[PDB]
Each structure stands twice: as C-alpha cells, then as structure tokens.
Amino acid sequence: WSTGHSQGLVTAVTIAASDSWDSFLKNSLTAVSLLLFIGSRCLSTYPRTSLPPTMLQDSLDNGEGRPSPMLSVRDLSIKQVEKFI
Amino acid sequence: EITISSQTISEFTHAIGNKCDAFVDRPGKATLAPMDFAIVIGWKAIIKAIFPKSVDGDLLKLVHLSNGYKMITGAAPLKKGDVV
C-alpha cells in the first residue's frame, strides 16, 4: 500500500492508477494539471503580502525561520500547544 | 466621479508590485487603496491643464519633473467603495 503527505498524496493516487508507461504519463498529466490549479487558487485566495522588516529581522535574530503561513513546532505535546494557541 | 472598486485596486497594486497587506482584500478589515491611486483618479483632470492655448509648446518634448502627494490633515485614506 502507499499514501502521501500534504501535497504528494496526488502522486500516491496516481501510482495506484498507473498501469503502463502511457497510463502513467496520462495520470501524471492529470496530476500536474491538478496541482497547478491548487497552486494558483491557494495563492489567489490568500495572497502572501509583504512583511514588516522589524518582524522578520527579529525572527531571524531569534533563530526562528523567515515568517511564513505555516509554523512547525517540535518537542511539545499536542495538549500544551493547543493550550498556547 | 469614479467608483474605486476592488478590481482596480488589485490591478494597480499588482502593476506597481505593492505588497502592503492593507490593500489586498482580507476578511474582517476594510479594503484600503494606495495613496498613489489619486493620479489614476486625477490624471485626466491634471493633464488637461497643459493643453490650454496660452501654454503653447512642444507637447512631445514634455518632461515630468516632480510629483508630490499630501493627505489633508485628518482625511481618511481611500476605501474600496468610495465615490471619488
């Protein structure tokens, strides 16, 4: 069996439909056409804008990453991250 | 009189490459327009001043020298429904 992460899950569902090389090619086409729509719409819906340079300057001085719509927190259980949020 | 719509604002901001989030439509916040949009509003009124017969010269060799914005003290910046 196989499955995919946030994005690649489409590649996983392609593989489960892939039989030959041409079938693989066709399904890959339907895939990249799909993920292109996703890339387009998920930006046109929430367009990333500029960010106050104080913010990212501080964040990079704090060793954190360049701010982005998604943040990864480590070493902390769910029950307490949900308490901080 | 022109109606400042969201589409015009978006097109303009993209044409100038402005990322300031006050102009991109976000829920729960009034859509703001860039202060430089006035020239878009006022060009067809501004340039009519260099046409009159008394100011007669080579229109082709015209050069734009300087521009200046000044918000009236206490004036509200533009919104996406303003009839201007």
UniProtKB/Swiss-Prot annotation, chain B:
[Alpha(6)beta(6)] hexamers of two multifunctional subunits (alpha and beta). This is Fatty acid synthase subunit beta. The gene is FAS1. Fatty acid synthetase catalyzes the formation of long-chain fatty acids from acetyl-CoA, malonyl-CoA and NADPH. The beta subunit contains domains for: [acyl-carrier-protein] acetyltransferase and malonyltransferase, S-acyl fatty acid synthase thioesterase, enoyl-[acyl-carrier-protein] reductase, and 3-hydroxypalmitoyl-[acyl-carrier-protein] dehydratase. It comes from the Eukaryota. It comes from Candida albicans (Yeast). Belongs to the fungal fatty acid synthetase subunit beta family.
